[PDB]
Symmetry: D2
Subunit: 171 residues, 4 copies
């Protein structure tokens, strides 16, 4: 038997413990097209049709973006683009209305409601029109059989859409 004294400098009294952390993935699409018909006399949308290139996704992370394109997500090879087609705008007042339309994600289509909020209608610098509005709403991955392999525990079943639009008149 012999007695020792720790060398505190090369001793580590250590532990490891596993925890969960919840976080929002925020993202946009860099490339999309839209057709916008709007009547400032009555603050009603007449036609709103959007096409989004799945390829142009951006969640501030290079390799998750690539991963989004694969079979367990978008299947961008087979289904390059997602689309929204307005079917009905039901006015609440000049600032607010309920928009109903058909969303299509990887070939599966469902009708969704978005909350339209008109953040501002104007005549621009040059005397030609502008508008600024938002579309907001929650859709469920499950309604679109989207990313079915991934559990609703790991990744939320709810996707929150925030479409923020500025837009100028045509020709």
């Amino acid at each position: 038997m012999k007695e020792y004294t720790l060398d505190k400098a090369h001793t580590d009294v250590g532990f490891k413990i596993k925890h969960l952390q919840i976080s929002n993935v925020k993202g946009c699409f860099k490339d999309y097209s839209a057709v916008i018909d709007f009547d400032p006399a009555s603050a009603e949308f007449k036609k709103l049709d959007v096409t989004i290139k799945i390829a142009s996704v951006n969640t501030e992370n290079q390799t998750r973006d690539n991963h989004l394109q694969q079979d367990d997500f978008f299947k961008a090879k087979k289904y390059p683009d997602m689309t929204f087609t307005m079917k009905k705008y039901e006015k609440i007042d000049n600032e607010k209305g309920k928009m109903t339309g058909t969303l299509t994600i990887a070939g599966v289509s469902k009708d969704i409601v978005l909350d339209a909020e008109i953040g501002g209608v104007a005549k621009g610098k040059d005397g030609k029109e502008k508008i600024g509005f938002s579309l907001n709403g929650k859709i469920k991955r499950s309604d679109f059989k989207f990313a079915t392999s991934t559990s609703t525990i790991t990744l939320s079943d709810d996707i929150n859409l925030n479409i923020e639009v500025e837009a100028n008149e045509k020709e």
Copy 2:
């Protein structure tokens, strides 16, 4: 009715989705004392008794460390220190043995097994002894009624102990 064209520069086609991520909290204690009795003739521990100042915790994060001291964790005001007392060392070979002892966390005591691995026995520069060994083992929060408020989902019930020791002879 009037037709518009998105201004892609001030338009954001955006989404938010919640996901979970698992991660290890790694930590040590900066301040502890120990008594170490070891027989290099037989590579057996004879006495190993450790006291750790809960206050000296470090998980590379200032405000979690403070939080660790509160009621839902250590209760460092009431129970300033955690202690380990060896009761039995059962040798496997010169490199390996099973250590049994009493761990006390916030006044609750349980007997635990650690896996002793002797990483090296030597005579130092000055002809006085040194040893380097590790103690490893898993303990359960639940066995110590520790952090009972926190679910075993958020934070794992299993804590992994890694004690890495270098140590020199006495007097």
Copy 3:
């Protein structure tokens, strides 16, 4: 050395593994009062004020109901009842409208939107009026600092309200 043969009848080749499962808690309140003013000429609500006795909760489970009354949830001793007060009904059509009101949970108050769906307006058997409608909407625990101790991982931050009402005229 000696050779043995398993007795398959008293041998168990076993394993244990921990998994997570997501589930909806569904619940109602057995005891509440309400004041309902509604104009069948225009299908507009005029006044809707509800008081719910927290005590009368029911989630098909005896001991969770008790637990709901405690500090980490409702605090029913201090705050026996939750209340809803309509501030505005904005009509969409005769079947649908957006209801805005003040919800109060344990003394904290926030304005919420519910989706009113009029499932049917009638003159009853006896020539006196009836109506059947639903109020639906999502509120966030966090907006009401509700059950703050419980993580948004264990229990969802989103509560989904489904108020299903049948109701007859007065005097």
Copy 4:
């Protein structure tokens, strides 16, 4: 405007909220073979080699068992059986020892340690030998690239082995 009174009998003041629950899957295998060489003079194992038919899994649930056989788990078509081969038994005392061996799950092989606990050595009714022992240890899914598609959040990375054996002498 007109005033109504709830019909409490056909009114439901309801809510839905999502929570997580952690649970142990307990399971065994109904069909396996083993070779057991053991020396009661010294309480040492000499050879222990086990083959388990993945097909014979049982987790008290019909359709999860089927699911276990598929690509995201066992791949029982390609890899019908898992195997354990003892490489070393290191004795602690007559009741306890550390067993090291090669586990093979779906063609991937790793060396694992089990804790042998001899629950009893005897001469049976007929004067022929019996033994009762347990093998216990934790293995990591990740070490065997097992069920890689499933997150370590949904399903724990740690599998706990409990092999409980009764066994009689040969010929």
